[PDB]
Design a protein around this nucleic acid. Structure first.
Lengths: 103, 47, 142, 110, 56, 117
RNA sequence: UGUAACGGGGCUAAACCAUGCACCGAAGCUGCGGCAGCGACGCUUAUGCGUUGUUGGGUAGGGGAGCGUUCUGUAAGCCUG
RNA sequence: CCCGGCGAGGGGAGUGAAAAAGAACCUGAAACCGUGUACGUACAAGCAGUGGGAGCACGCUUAGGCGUGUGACUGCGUACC
């Protein structure tokens, strides 16, 4: 069993019990995750649908990793202009693990 | 002492301190431009 | 994303040979280039080669069509100061038959160290000299 | 268990000595100090005097048995140098460095 | 003349590794005693290769 | 009064020298080139993040071009036929069925050969 | 001085000229995450939330505003064998 | 008291909370080379780095599928005032 689902501009393929990268969850680790945004499902034949999403289809997941990564520094300057610029960056991460695929 | 007193602000300029780099405004010529006595010792010109 | 790694358990060398007997030098080079680069199959290839091992066995019997057989010349700077040599195809293959395949295929490969890591795996023979007889090369006919 | 012997401020630079102190490493307990019975240069005597101390003084300075005694470390380091000037015309200064070394030997019951 | 900073120990040791060629030959036993001696050189007894060389 | 500069000038050296070590010579600790192992290294890291955004984009094009050329059509004409066919596209990273599912990718190139007039 | 007046090969068409449709093509356009400033539209006045619009590489020089350092006071305090 | 040339300079017992507190005695970082050990290093041309990585070594862990250290080799790459 595998499925394909939507989140904004991006489309993701995932299999039963698998882990996958997601965009930052605002609720962190504090809640389970579910999607009805599923647009393809296969278990022995890989049939496509042109109609908008699987009717009554559900994907269920749990949050396995969430947070804000290591701090970094990058710098900018110009030849013989005697200044120095510095940017700090961290970025947020989120990974989720499948608990169900239902149709 | 001061300690328990509320301070006053906006009544001193903070101040005579000279620029240390152009990210803070002014750098290697301190607002006097390049060379001549006008950049080293007062206004650089007589009466 | 990452899903593949080239190493000898995922990329097995199986040894192929292109029959050069009466083959056109350019058409033979366009085959030898893509089969030294690994480009004929469903592959993932970074700054490495995903090859199968390929050689040439009868190089002194390779052909050129129409003209450029006794006209035009190939140049080489010998390394003895400003020293240079020049010869035409039919009088060069008479002397250095294994060089003719090298100078024909090298410009169909990448530049620099990656192009060198492909070239080091290529061997060329003349007189049907069978020196990889334990590797049992599979013949390709173009 | 362990016994240490030294010689500090010796009249040699350490690289004169270290060639021999590196050569005698990696040898059997049948060959250590037996490869040093006949020696080359003052360099080897500076090691011999300290090694013949460590491998024999443990009989009073560690315990009664030394009949399986092994050398664990055998090394030499450059000591403090002394600065001295020499004659040149229209002086001006011209110096040399009078070197020293520190010899170290360690032995163990295991 | 020019030399930048210091010679690398990776090249200096590679120039020391042929400077003396010092070898272990374990020495040979003397031909009159139960102890080893230096090749073609006199023993502490004043002997060499089966005969007396100096007085004691 | 005298500025001890341990908390300032020396700290501004150590903030860079901390990012040294691990190198094949002098840059592990020689400050006037360990500085270049942060400054020139950052001009190389900007190029790493630029080239992995510009030149690695070709892996979504050239790999797919070769696979469509096994069906006898080139990328520049294949994509115009697939536009005329409608659906089955969004982002160029999603085309790796050209290696993973060559039978279904063959049918998608053949769809473009049934829409390109 | 030696490959050396396309960088070089291929190529009698694979050159030269112009033509017809496609594709590749920036740090920008464009989508999103975040920030400061300017201003509207919807709801609300701990003052925010929602959406839409828009500016943000800046050196001689002209303005605005932080973090450390040291002394002096706090310190008859607070940390410390 | 042990070692040696009644050496040189250490060590054993011993003074001491400390002898990296021994008159060459507060505490102590760097350049410079040095003792051990793990991975790495055997043809290949330019600021010695930046990214990728076969191999090897270390420590967890096994219903949707490890990380760390080290790294041949290779895409990218002509400093600073």
């Amino acid at each position: 069993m595998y499925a394909v689902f939507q989140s904004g501009g991006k489309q993701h393929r995932v299999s039963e019990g698998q882990t996958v990268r997601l965009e930052k969850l605002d609720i962190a680790t504090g809640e389970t995750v579910e999607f009805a945004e599923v647009l393809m499902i296969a278990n022995g034949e890989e049939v496509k649908i042109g109609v908008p999403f699987v009717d009554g289809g559900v994907i269920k997941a749990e949050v396995v990793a969430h947070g804000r990564g290591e701090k970094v520094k990058i710098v900018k300057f110009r030849r013989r202009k005697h200044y120095r610029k510095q940017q700090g960056h961290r970025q947020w991460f989120t990974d989720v693990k499948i608990t169900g695929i239902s149709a | 002492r001061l300690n328990t007193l509320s301070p006053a602000e906006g009544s001193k300029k903070a101040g005579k301190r000279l620029g240390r780099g152009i990210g803070s405004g002014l750098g290697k010529t301190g607002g006097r431009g390049h060379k001549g006595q006008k950049s080293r010792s007062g206004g650089g010109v007589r009466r | 994303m990452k899903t593949f790694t080239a190493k000898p358990e995922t990329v097995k060398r199986d040894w192929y040979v292109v029959d050069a007997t009466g083959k056109t030098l350019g058409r033979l080079a366009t085959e030898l280039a893509r089969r030294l680069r690994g480009k004929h199959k469903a592959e993932y290839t970074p700054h490495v080669d995903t090859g199968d091992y390929i050689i040439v066995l009868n190089a002194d019997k390779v052909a050129v069509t129409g003209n450029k057989r006794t006209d035009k010349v190939y140049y080489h700077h010998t390394g003895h100061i400003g020293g240079i040599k020049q010869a035409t195809f039919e009088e060069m293959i008479a002397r250095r038959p294994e060089r003719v395949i090298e100078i024909a295929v090298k410009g169909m490969l990448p530049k620099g160290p990656l192009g060198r890591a492909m070239f080091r795996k290529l061997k060329v023979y003349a007189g049907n000299e069978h020196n990889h007889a334990a590797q049992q090369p599979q013949v390709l006919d173009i | 268990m362990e016994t240490i012997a030294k010689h500090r401020h010796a009249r040699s630079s350490a690289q004169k000595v270290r060639l021999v102190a590196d050569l005698i490493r990696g040898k059997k307990v049948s060959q250590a100090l037996d490869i040093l019975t006949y020696t080359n240069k003052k360099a080897a005597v500076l090691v011999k005097k300290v090694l013949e101390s460590a491998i024999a003084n443990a009989e009073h300075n560690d315990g009664a048995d030394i009949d399986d005694l092994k050398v664990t470390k055998i090394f030499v380091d450059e000591g403090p140098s002394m600065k001295r000037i020499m004659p040149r015309a229209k002086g001006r200064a011209d110096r040399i460095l009078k070197r020293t070394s520190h010899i170290t030997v360690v032995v163990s019951d295991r | 003349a020019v030399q930048q900073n210091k010679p690398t120990r990776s090249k200096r040791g590679m120039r020391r590794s042929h400077d003396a060629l010092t070898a272990v030959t374990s020495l040979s036993v003397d031909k009159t005693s139960g102890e080893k001696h230096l090749r073609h050189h006199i023993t502490a007894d004043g002997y060499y290769r089966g005969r007396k060389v100096i007085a004691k | 009064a005298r500025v001890k500069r341990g908390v300032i000038a020396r700290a501004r050296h150590k903030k860079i020298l901390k990012q040294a070590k691990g190198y094949y010579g002098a840059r592990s600790r020689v400050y006037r080139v360990a500085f270049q192992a942060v400054i020139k290294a950052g001009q190389y890291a900007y190029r790493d993040r630029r080239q992995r955004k510009r030149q690695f984009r070709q892996l979504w094009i050239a790999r797919i071009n070769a696979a469509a050329r096994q069906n006898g059509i080139s990328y520049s004409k294949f994509i115009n036929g697939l536009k005329k066919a409608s659906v089955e596209i969004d982002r160029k990273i999603l085309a790796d069925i050209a290696v993973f599912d060559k039978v279904a990718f063959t049918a998608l190139v053949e769809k473009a050969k049934a829409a390109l007039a």
